[model samples]
Target chain A: AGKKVLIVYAHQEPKSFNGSLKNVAVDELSRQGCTVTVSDLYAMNFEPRATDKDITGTLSNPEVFNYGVETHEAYKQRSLASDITDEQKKVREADLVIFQFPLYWFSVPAILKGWMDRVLCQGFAFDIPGFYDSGLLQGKLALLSVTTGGTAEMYTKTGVNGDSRYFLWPLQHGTLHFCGFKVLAPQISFAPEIASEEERKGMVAAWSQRLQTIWKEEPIPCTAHWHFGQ
Target chain B: AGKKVLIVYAHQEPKSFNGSLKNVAVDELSRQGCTVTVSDLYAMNFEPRATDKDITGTLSNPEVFNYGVETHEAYKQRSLASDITDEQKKVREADLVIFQFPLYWFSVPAILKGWMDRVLCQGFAFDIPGFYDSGLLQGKLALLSVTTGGTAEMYTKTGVNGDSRYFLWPLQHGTLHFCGFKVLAPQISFAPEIASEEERKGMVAAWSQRLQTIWKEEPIPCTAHWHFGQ
Candidate 1:
């Protein structure tokens, strides 16, 4: 009952709906004797840009810079910035990684996306031959706990947003699944801004209730058909 | 011949594949007598985080913080950060907008995604009723000229990463089209990191050649069937 949870949270305010959801996760998970860590991106003033500055030492190739290659070498040589290394260490220690954010442009916020781009480098999170089903972070659990500004009906197949699952493909399949985390079905708390105070409480309560039994849940098949029906 | 173009470029190095593609666009579009501007995100040291700092003045709703709602009010009141407003000015002036970046986790790099999230906010790019077909920037054009580390085969329907088009849905359909820009088909230069000097030159030349006749091209029917393919 001593699971380690890493919540990579991206929201500006501590009192936002996103913050409530994140607090509930920490509260419930801590009550269950689990260790909880939250990477509060805004509070940290996290760097969202990925650049050569990410490496503290000399470039592997000075003339031509390729981020994917350079960062991989940095990870191997232990030359990555302390901030990045610190996050990677948390990821390595965690049994469950939860991304808590309000969806921006149908995906994670830039700061959180930067966390994925920088920390999940070639050597650390995956290698060319050791990705997908055989990825380095295999056996760990990952989940997207996203809050949206749109209603649930608008995320359906024929709805204006064209299925919430469609937008989940890149993050869930391309990144998370590629890195070998068994991705649990996403928790989409829709339109919290428009919801009544009771509805907001209900959403937070539902998330806490789910967290009580998250370990018993199974991952959705991160397949094309599942995201975009046949 | 006097059209305006804005290239929102995101790449660390100017000598990289992404840079070469961007340079070629400048060259070709300039040759065609088009006014061209580039938001070199990295060079600008752009702020990618969408925080309260984005709004210059007091919060519309101080107690409850909602990014979309707050930013929308800020835009209407001309209170958005000057940097965000500067980019918006360029977009407003452009006849065609091009995004040049290396693919990170099968999507735009965080900085570029931040541009979309921050610059294309409500009351400016779209309102609740002014999205999709009725978007404010209806007559403008947009294109994503992407480079990937993965081979073309890896992005196929039966390949390891599934169809590349699947990843484009969020950008092309969700963001670009939602903002009322006509979506031009993307130019994907695959595996540039693995390409030889000759292959790299060919890719650069190909992009230049495309820009020579870009004006003749029509936007793709940004429909579900177009991206999903029944």
Candidate 2:
């Protein structure tokens, strides 16, 4: 299958476990004849703060600044910063967007979070009358391929972390769903730093294997029940 | 009442509702004879990215970078960047830490999240064996005072966004509790952007009133039931 994939990758070192995963995705996806691009956030030294500088032109309201409102207006006026527009262009062309990063404080790195806050403006990603099912990016697919320091056992329903799904609710349902991306089930590679070299290789291979049949996959239900489980 | 408090405030504009809430906290806490300090993230232009730059000296693994492991080691070696160490010093001195920010996609803004990721490294906040009930900084307290673009009605169990408590799990239980801070109930000022001038003032007044009795409040049993009620 032919598809344009954008990986929003956030890791500093190119030789790290997170880097290996990103590399595997590019290699495997390219072999499958799909176009793959990556926003390597750390390598790019991506701006991780959302501020007045995001808008290139005059402020919609010069006296007060509200990021959400100002960005929305900027998106409509084509006045957002070039970097933000560049990322938006990647999102616009991509058939699927995959976020690849190690979990920091039970969430994505600040750089990637900044990407969402800045790029997913109201006019571009969603409008007042259009959100959730009817949102602007409805046809696009999104997935979070995350790595964590905590093992799978620690992220269980009865475990100390109180189930990994508890943390995914905000990222999956609140952000991606609200933006209208059909979310694929997340690929959680847990505790790679502590694993043996063989285990780490296996994790990379598994990701490569998944990518081979990625197009055949369906989006998850992404409901409260899917997250919390009754 | 004489305890020292640090408010990690993360709003871009000083005239916003978040600014009002933060101002009220400082005013009320000062009036109560408590020492108050605010880390105004935007005003300080805080560095939000976690990179090799964060560690002042050599990384533990110079070949491959792992942020968590490196930062943890840096904490022991006293090689962390001055900015990060300064924040840690504030956290160490404070009896209470309050995080105030606008909710960006059902979570804290990237700046504040970066603060948690960088400041609360493994050695400083928690260790492999010492987390949850046995975490460091056990005697301190922490609270999340957040503002949301969504209305109160939209954050209910049956609403489009699910229960407000559903999103609080990661911040309160995962990060704060894991760091040994006794968690206080979150103060969520919803839809301040849409509220009338008087309504915004009322919300600010309500927060001031709550701060008057904040010391008397007990920590919620930050269990599974509190987040996902039966």
Candidate 3:
């Protein structure tokens, strides 16, 4: 009952459907005596661009800047930008991390993607010998709570969008799984803008209900087989 | 030739592998007598966040900011921020658009992702009925010239990272195809940092050679099966 949850939220409006989902997560988790923290990206005016500025002090290379190399060195030297380190701290302390956002271009928005790119550096998240199943954050749990503009019917294998799972591979397997988090089945609220008010409320209720027993759930395989049938 | 090409370049260093790939594309395309415009994201200090500030004058919904809806309306009103309009102009003028970047989290970097999120808004790039084969940018050709940290072996179907095609689903199919662009096969130079200088030069040369005849190439099917085998 003492679980810590960190929700990296990306939405501009507090009253948006995504906002409603984020609020329900906070309230329900708090009701269960869990500690909850939200990184409201748009509200924070979060820096999404990854540049040399991400390193606090002198760059690892003074001439040619390779972001991955520089960031890895900065992370090891405790010289990464404060914003990154601050998020990393939350990630380190959390038992569960929830990414709450509306899908943009079939993935997380630029701001939240920035958070992943910057905070989850090589030294902090995964190194060459310490990624995927044996990743540094292997024991942690991660979930993507996403909202979409298209109906579920349109995201099927033969449908125009080509199965929602196809889009999740990069974020779930490539990013979160690479960093070693056991990924829970995503909470996808499809076409919330077109849904009836009752439907939206039902979606929110479903998310809250799921949260009540999240600890009992098992993570998906995070594999090609699991995402696309053999 | 009167054809126009736009290269959306994303990399921190001009001398890095990604930069070399971008430079070769520019030089070869120009050599073909195509008008090439390079949008160097880092050099431009491109804005990656989608916010209320992106819509100048007045937002569509002042009380609760929904980015998609706001941006869509802003696009129709000719009120979107200049940065977004600037990129849209390039897209509108281009016969081909090549995205050049090192793969970050199995996808585009935050800045480049931001370019997609901010610039390729609805009404400009696609509408509900205008997506996929009927998308607004349908006639234009698009290619992703990506560099990666992982070896090609690691990105196979049986390997730990799954097939590289799985990761490309969201970008090539979901995003590019959604916007009606004819998807050229990607140029993926794996583990360039680990490759020898000669190998690196070969990779760069290969891209230049491909650019010389890019127009004759056929677009991939961009189907779910094309990305994931049955």
Question: How are the candidates ranked when ordered by DockQ, highest leading?
Answer: 3, 2, 1
Estimate, for each residue in A97-148, the C-alpha lDDT of model 2 and write its tens digit.
9999988877888888888888888888888887888778899999999999
Candidates 1 and 2 compared: the better one by DockQ is 2
- Segments in model 1 whose C-alpha atoms lie over 4 Å from true places: none
Tens-digit lDDT track of model 3 for A33-96: 9999999998988998999999987886889988888999999998888999999999999999
| Candidate No. with top DockQ | 3
Q: Candidate 1 on B1-230: residue-level lDDT in tens? A: 77999999999999888888999999999989999999999999988889888898799988877788889999999999999999999999999999999999989999988899899999999987899989988999999999988899998987988898999999998999999999999999999878998999999999999999999999999988888874
Per-residue error (Å), model 1, residue B121: 1.1
Candidate 1 is graded, for docking, as: high
lDDT (Cα) of model 3: 0.92
Per residue, candidate 3 scores C-alpha lDDT tens digits across B31-67 of 8889999999999999999888899997776887788
Model 1 TM-score? 0.98
Model 1: residue B85 alpha-carbon error in angstroms: 0.6
Each model's TM-score, in the order given?
0.98, 0.98, 0.99
How close to the true structure is residue B42 of candidate 2, measured as C-alpha lDDT? 93
Highest lDDT: give the candidate number. 3
